[PDB]
């Protein structure tokens, strides 16, 4: 089968401006395993991004955690760009600090 | 608790992508990791600290080398045209009286198509590919007995050993840092977002309360953290201006009494 | 290979009754711990069973209605649940009806014979059509809410299984392997494969269908 | 005098369309100045046409599916509009479905061939079935609101006409001649005589019926 | 507008002491003729008993109806099968707008219209089987075709023209209704108001309820005749309990030029 | 066809107690012609009951007017019994002074 990916962008700790935190872009429930993930700072591919072990859940769909260390400002915009076989064009998700 | 091996082989991996990789899990905690490139089973996260003997990790690596072989063999018996994604879920869960219950499922292109039947000592399945792969694996020397030991002795002993060596790793209790926030996304209807930020174990419940009364539970989202911890968030859409009279209730194991969060 | 089949219908299978709507399996997944019935060729080419109806007898004829002998199970097609097989497919048939220029409704009929008794719990729904006011074209829709229930299959019994899928855009040339669930709030046209899924036909009803034994 | 008939369906008749509900004639009366179609034996024994559908081809077979030639019209039965004849009845069939007790549903099928083109304005209705909640049994009903429209019959064409009646009480032994209207707020069961009246079947669909050439 | 029509009815198994055949002749909405197999004589009705119609006129009608009595009773014989049978006939002609006669010749067997008279070919037409039988039998009578042709194309128009001279006053009778707008409590919370028009002619009367002078809807109306040719009508309406007042029944009949307003009576 | 009869019972002039009037029972729209009508005084067939000629209306259904002279009292009930081939049991209709 082929499954579209589910993207969530959040912070490891509450997004206190001016302190150091971790941005996680968690992609889950996709199939097959090949996926393109870029964290983005104002539209810029963040090169210092580490990913977790490509795993799968009980429903045989794969999941991945991309993360980066960061310090939030009151003016910056973080997003997560994903491309998968199921996506025509790469989807983008902005990080609402509420999450 | 349960020890599970998440095995994945792809018939056409990307360049620099291992065509085989494994992730081992003790409950919801990643401890083992393998792939075809490095070819060695290395501990993960906070399992590099447990007092495991030195050969333990080599013995694991030898087991996973046998499995790497088998999984790569299957694509051969497949026939047809590629690509393929062969998956395997191998493990054992310690039942109440040291009675390990094994698990041995396999999914081809994401469709559960095969099992290992202990009653018959062989890989079973009725999908055509299930038959092909199962016959091929059945003819690969002692692969039947290798898997039989991997499920009936190797896995349960590893579990009991890891449990004694991992008691602390398993009794990790990190209570969540909560942050109830408000978002005016919908016109005339502001959505309230409750967020538990770094916690372990992953069992956490989020309720919403309306003026001290039970208002429900929002849309729930759940995920891991870069430290192996977990993150949780709930969203509830309420009428604009009633947000002040709303509270979020979190029931986590690391909180001895359920916590109450305000705006 | 093409044969005209006279199916003599049996009694309704639970939860269906002669005075109730016909229930069918709507989604492509199942209640926790059970599975759908799948008529499959391989892991990439399979269709999920939606409509279940028991066939009390099968009479075989050639394309001129001259009697023929009961053909053998179609090689490569089988009815599976999770990893185990449960039935043999003896004849297949698809109905491609162009709802619009791009929207196509493909209904597939599978005449199977159960080889191993079984049961499944599936999420069932029915067909409905709301009254309107005047010549307003009311559409044929599928109910959204599902009612979980158990469907039981008896060994050696004949069963007529159905899958309808709406194929958007361009259409492939051969057998449509598109496994689409019964989208809710989506209108469906009637075709010969669906007349028995409005209400359970009375026992001993007959239908002749022009089927094949190969894909 | 019993033949299995294979009917090949034509295009919908106005106001029916492949993407609309099937309109059927609801009551036993007509707009002022028009009339119902009646399939009649005499003034005392006649049935009002409710369901109309055009047949593009008729192939005749014996009760064993051995070819036959098109019989002669059933003498004594005729399609009468007002006091004028319009078609000959070639084959009939009745389907008796026991709804609970003290109620029988009788659906009558008339394979007629038109002999004089004609037009009639009838009060038309449709089958609808409201969505419900849970395993609640929703009924198949006829709408109360009728829509007046014209039905046109072209000469020499084949037609399948239908009358369904809910026979309350004791039952006669032979052909049931009860001319009952399509009752609103009454629940109807499906039988083979009604499968083509949910939505117009796509052109060239086939159906075989076991019909008689005498009453 | 004006139409001379004859209503013929024959019954195959009539009641004991009941005529097996009877006729009523009608000018507009007024009966002027009566016949039956028993008395066998066409007698005037209502205010047509004072018409200056000569006896010859009424003798000619009686003889015509004797011929029709024959044809009608003959029909049952030619029918066959088991009874009972009720054969009805509507034969007449209407004065069209431009002094033109429109014939009418319809026949109904057991309450089902099955036969007509085709003036072209002078034949009874119909495709119901009984239509064929009765039609052939009547076609084999003594110029019965020519008698029906004349009764439709000459005799009826001529009789119509005369009846308009001697009895025109009978049709323009005008008697206005005596009203009563009573109130009945239908159920706790509601009350049915009954407006009753009692003796009037012509039959056309329209009732309308009014709500504090605003338009309200005329409710279920039932309507019928009286022994003297006058009519009775009554309409009901369900209004809220205690709002029985603020309601006036407005009646519009030919008798009253200005529409009459009726009020509840204590 | 067989048509069930429609029965209406009313008085000739406005219902007034102690004042001679006419009770009419109008039976209409029935078929066949034989019909059985009885006016009833507190449950008794009035022997002095007169009717009209059996006529029919435009749809070929018969209609009849039964009438009798009477005098309304305070305590009294008049009704109309009709039996026809289409009625299992004889139908009864009471005269309310409304009509």
Author numbering:
A (entry chain D), F (entry chain G): 21 to 119
B (entry chain C): 28 to 290
C (entry chain E), D (entry chain H): 430 to 644
E (entry chain F): 27 to 292
Verbatim from the authors:
Human astroviruses (HAstVs) are a leading cause of viral gastroenteritis in children worldwide. Recently the neonatal Fc receptor (FcRn) was identified as a receptor for HAstV, however the molecular basis for the FcRn-HAstV interaction remained unclear. FcRn is a heterodimeric receptor formed by a heavy chain (FcRn α-chain, or αFcRn) and a light chain (β2 microglobulin, or β2M). The viral genome is encapsulated by 180 copies of the HAstV capsid to form the immature HAstV particle, presenting 90 dimeric spikes.
To understand the molecular basis for HAstV spike binding to FcRn, we crystallized and solved the 3.4Å-resolution crystal structure of the HAstV1 spike - FcRn complex. At the ~ 570 Å2 binding interface, two loops on the HAstV1 spike wrap around FcRn residue W154. The W154 side chain sits in a hydrophobic pocket formed by HAstV1 spike residues A469, V472, Y475, and L509. The negatively charged FcRn residue E138 forms an electrostatic interaction with the positively charged HAstV1 spike residue K467, and it also forms a hydrogen bond with Y475. The remaining hydrogen bonds are between FcRn residues D153, W154, and E156 sidechains and the backbone of HAstV1 spike residues K514, N511, and V472, respectively. Finally, the HAstV1 spike - FcRn binding interaction is capped by β2M residue I21 contacting HAstV1 spike residues V472, D473, and Y475, forming ~ 40 Å2 of the interface.
